[PDB]
Design a protein around this motif. Structure first.
Motif, PDB file in Angstrom:
ATOM      1  N   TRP A  54      29.436 -46.038 -89.138  1.00 26.13           N
ATOM      2  CA  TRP A  54      28.569 -45.027 -88.517  1.00 26.13           C
ATOM      3  C   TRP A  54      28.297 -43.883 -89.522  1.00 26.13           C
ATOM      4  CZ3 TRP A  54      27.474 -40.137 -87.392  1.00 26.13           C
ATOM      5  CH2 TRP A  54      26.564 -39.878 -86.374  1.00 26.13           C
ATOM      6  N   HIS A  55      29.345 -43.231 -90.000  1.00 27.67           N
ATOM      7  CA  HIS A  55      29.200 -42.262 -91.056  1.00 27.67           C
ATOM      8  C   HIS A  55      28.906 -42.941 -92.389  1.00 27.67           C
ATOM      9  CE1 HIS A  55      29.986 -38.351 -89.365  1.00 27.67           C
ATOM     10  NE2 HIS A  55      30.975 -38.857 -88.639  1.00 27.67           N
ATOM     11  N   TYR A  56      28.175 -42.237 -93.238  1.00 28.80           N
ATOM     12  CA  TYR A  56      27.798 -42.789 -94.505  1.00 28.80           C
ATOM     13  C   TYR A  56      28.856 -42.392 -95.512  1.00 28.80           C
ATOM     14  CZ  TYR A  56      23.104 -43.406 -92.523  1.00 28.80           C
ATOM     15  OH  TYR A  56      22.032 -43.815 -91.789  1.00 28.80           O
ATOM     16  N   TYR A 115      25.518 -24.505 -98.097  1.00 28.01           N
ATOM     17  CA  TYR A 115      26.862 -25.010 -98.310  1.00 28.01           C
ATOM     18  C   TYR A 115      27.688 -24.743 -97.077  1.00 28.01           C
ATOM     19  CZ  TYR A 115      25.572 -25.492-103.196  1.00 28.01           C
ATOM     20  OH  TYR A 115      24.935 -25.837-104.350  1.00 28.01           O
ATOM     21  N   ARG A 116      28.487 -25.720 -96.676  1.00 26.27           N
ATOM     22  CA  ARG A 116      29.284 -25.498 -95.498  1.00 26.27           C
ATOM     23  C   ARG A 116      30.545 -26.347 -95.399  1.00 26.27           C
ATOM     24  NH1 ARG A 116      26.934 -29.046 -91.171  1.00 26.27           N
ATOM     25  NH2 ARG A 116      26.468 -30.541 -92.814  1.00 26.27           N
ATOM     26  N   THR A 117      31.490 -25.819 -94.633  1.00 26.53           N
ATOM     27  CA  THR A 117      32.790 -26.444 -94.471  1.00 26.53           C
ATOM     28  C   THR A 117      32.709 -27.240 -93.193  1.00 26.53           C
ATOM     29  OG1 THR A 117      34.071 -24.617 -95.461  1.00 26.53           O
ATOM     30  CG2 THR A 117      35.215 -26.051 -94.005  1.00 26.53           C
ATOM     31  N   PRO A 121      34.136 -25.172 -85.105  1.00 24.45           N
ATOM     32  CA  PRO A 121      32.801 -25.529 -85.541  1.00 24.45           C
ATOM     33  C   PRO A 121      32.616 -25.350 -87.043  1.00 24.45           C
ATOM     34  CG  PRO A 121      32.769 -23.353 -84.542  1.00 24.45           C
ATOM     35  CD  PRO A 121      34.171 -23.880 -84.394  1.00 24.45           C
ATOM     36  N   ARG A 122      31.463 -25.793 -87.517  1.00 28.62           N
ATOM     37  CA  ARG A 122      31.125 -25.697 -88.924  1.00 28.62           C
ATOM     38  C   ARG A 122      30.988 -24.239 -89.216  1.00 28.62           C
ATOM     39  NH1 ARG A 122      32.406 -30.393 -88.739  1.00 28.62           N
ATOM     40  NH2 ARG A 122      31.170 -32.183 -89.485  1.00 28.62           N
ATOM     41  N   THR A 123      30.891 -23.932 -90.499  1.00 31.76           N
ATOM     42  CA  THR A 123      31.242 -22.635 -91.049  1.00 31.76           C
ATOM     43  C   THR A 123      30.444 -22.534 -92.344  1.00 31.76           C
ATOM     44  OG1 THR A 123      33.439 -21.993 -90.252  1.00 31.76           O
ATOM     45  CG2 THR A 123      33.109 -21.850 -92.655  1.00 31.76           C
ATOM     46  N   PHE A 172      33.750 -39.446 -99.722  1.00 32.84           N
ATOM     47  CA  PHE A 172      32.453 -39.004-100.176  1.00 32.84           C
ATOM     48  C   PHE A 172      31.402 -39.472 -99.121  1.00 32.84           C
ATOM     49  CE2 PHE A 172      34.356 -38.408-104.361  1.00 32.84           C
ATOM     50  CZ  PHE A 172      35.423 -39.286-104.287  1.00 32.84           C
ATOM     51  N   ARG A 173      30.417 -38.620 -98.855  1.00 35.91           N
ATOM     52  CA  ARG A 173      29.375 -38.861 -97.868  1.00 35.91           C
ATOM     53  C   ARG A 173      28.019 -38.360 -98.398  1.00 35.91           C
ATOM     54  NH1 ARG A 173      28.895 -35.666 -92.190  1.00 35.91           N
ATOM     55  NH2 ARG A 173      27.322 -34.458 -93.364  1.00 35.91           N
ATOM     56  N   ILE A 174      27.051 -39.262 -98.488  1.00 39.61           N
ATOM     57  CA  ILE A 174      25.657 -38.890 -98.744  1.00 39.61           C
ATOM     58  C   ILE A 174      24.736 -39.495 -97.682  1.00 39.61           C
ATOM     59  CG2 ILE A 174      25.849 -38.440-101.195  1.00 39.61           C
ATOM     60  CD1 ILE A 174      25.301 -41.136-101.889  1.00 39.61           C
TER      61      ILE A 174
HETATM   62  C1  99C Z   1      19.787 -39.264 -92.219  1.00 41.11           C
HETATM   63  C2  99C Z   1      21.087 -39.213 -91.412  1.00 41.11           C
HETATM   64  C3  99C Z   1      21.879 -40.345 -91.331  1.00 41.11           C
HETATM   65  C4  99C Z   1      23.050 -40.312 -90.585  1.00 41.11           C
HETATM   66  C5  99C Z   1      23.412 -39.155 -89.921  1.00 41.11           C
HETATM   67  C6  99C Z   1      24.716 -39.123 -89.157  1.00 41.11           C
HETATM   68  C7  99C Z   1      25.799 -38.894 -90.211  1.00 41.11           C
HETATM   69  C8  99C Z   1      26.368 -37.719 -90.416  1.00 41.11           C
HETATM   70  C9  99C Z   1      26.012 -36.436 -89.647  1.00 41.11           C
HETATM   71  O1  99C Z   1      26.992 -36.099 -88.717  1.00 41.11           O
HETATM   72  P1  99C Z   1      26.776 -34.742 -87.804  1.00 41.11           P
HETATM   73  O2  99C Z   1      28.044 -34.271 -87.118  1.00 41.11           O
HETATM   74  O3  99C Z   1      25.599 -34.876 -86.890  1.00 41.11           O
HETATM   75  O4  99C Z   1      26.381 -33.605 -88.881  1.00 41.11           O
HETATM   76  P2  99C Z   1      27.473 -32.978 -89.919  1.00 41.11           P
HETATM   77  O5  99C Z   1      28.866 -33.813 -90.090  1.00 41.11           O
HETATM   78  O6  99C Z   1      26.774 -32.823 -91.189  1.00 41.11           O
HETATM   79  O7  99C Z   1      27.777 -31.662 -89.365  1.00 41.11           O
HETATM   80  C10 99C Z   1      26.149 -40.076 -91.102  1.00 41.11           C
HETATM   81  O8  99C Z   1      27.384 -39.947 -91.715  1.00 41.11           O
HETATM   82  C11 99C Z   1      22.592 -38.041 -89.947  1.00 41.11           C
HETATM   83  C12 99C Z   1      21.438 -38.052 -90.728  1.00 41.11           C
END
Ligand code: 99C
Length: 187
Positions: A54-56, A115-117, A121-123, A172-174
């Motif tokens: 699910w996550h990249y 830039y964020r942590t 919640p996010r920060t 790592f996540r892109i």
């Molecule tokens: C183009 C695209 C592909 C996939 C997504 C969902 C993902 C992260 C996002 O997770 P989320 O919690 O919504 O945001 P964050 O972890 O950046 O805060 C993928 O890891 C979003 C956008």
């Protein structure tokens, strides 16, 4: 500078090697397994249980249960990236918010300049200058994970005093499709 001169006296350089079998199929890992990119389309790959689906994300092959460790990443001019560490046992299948409560300690960049942590919640982070190269630092025993600008030595963020019960991988996540890869600098 002091960052270059001292880091190896305090932290063991990790040789981070990206683990292709963990990589979401929408990611492509370089032959030499130091770089990861986002692809136009999913690779034809199995949903083996190590794979984030699910996550990249993608992880390094080696995890840590102790000690002090650091690796460095060329983020260059990418407009979007998040990196950090996560527990061996995070949820890799199906949606979960990447938070410390869920075993992710990561920070990063969105939308060119935000830039964020990835806390709950996010920060927001205010960085004087944009890092081209980030040093990620782990101290298992104290529980600190820190990021630095690995050129000029500036502090970016620290998660303080985390109680780890688990092996930790580099992660790592892109999300975006972009000319510039995320690339790990060996020592
Ligand atoms: C183009 C695209 C592909 C996939 C997504 C969902 C993902 C992260 C996002 O997770 P989320 O919690 O919504 O945001 P964050 O972890 O950046 O805060 C993928 O890891 C979003 C956008």
């Amino acid at each position: 500078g002091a960052y270059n001169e001292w880091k190896k006296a305090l932290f063991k350089p990790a040789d981070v090697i990206l683990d292709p079998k963990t990589a979401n199929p929408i990611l492509l890992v370089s032959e030499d397994q130091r770089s990861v990119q986002r692809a136009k389309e999913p690779q034809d790959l199995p949903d083996n249980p190590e794979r984030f689906n699910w996550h990249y994300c993608v992880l390094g092959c080696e995890s840590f249960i102790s000690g002090r460790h650091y690796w460095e990443v060329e983020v260059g001019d990418r407009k979007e990236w998040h990196i950090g560490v996560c527990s061996k046992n995070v949820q890799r299948k199906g949606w979960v918010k990447m938070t410390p409560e869920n075993g992710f300690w990561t920070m990063g960049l969105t939308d060119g300049n935000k830039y964020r942590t990835l806390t709950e919640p996010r920060t927001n982070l205010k960085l004087p200058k944009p890092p081209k190269k980030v040093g990620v630092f782990l101290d298992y025993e104290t529980g600190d994970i820190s990021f630095y600008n690995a050129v000029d030595g500036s502090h970016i963020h620290t998660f303080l005093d985390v109680s780890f019960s688990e092996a930790l991988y580099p992660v790592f996540r892109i999300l975006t499709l972009e000319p510039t890869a995320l690339t790990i600098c060996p020592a």
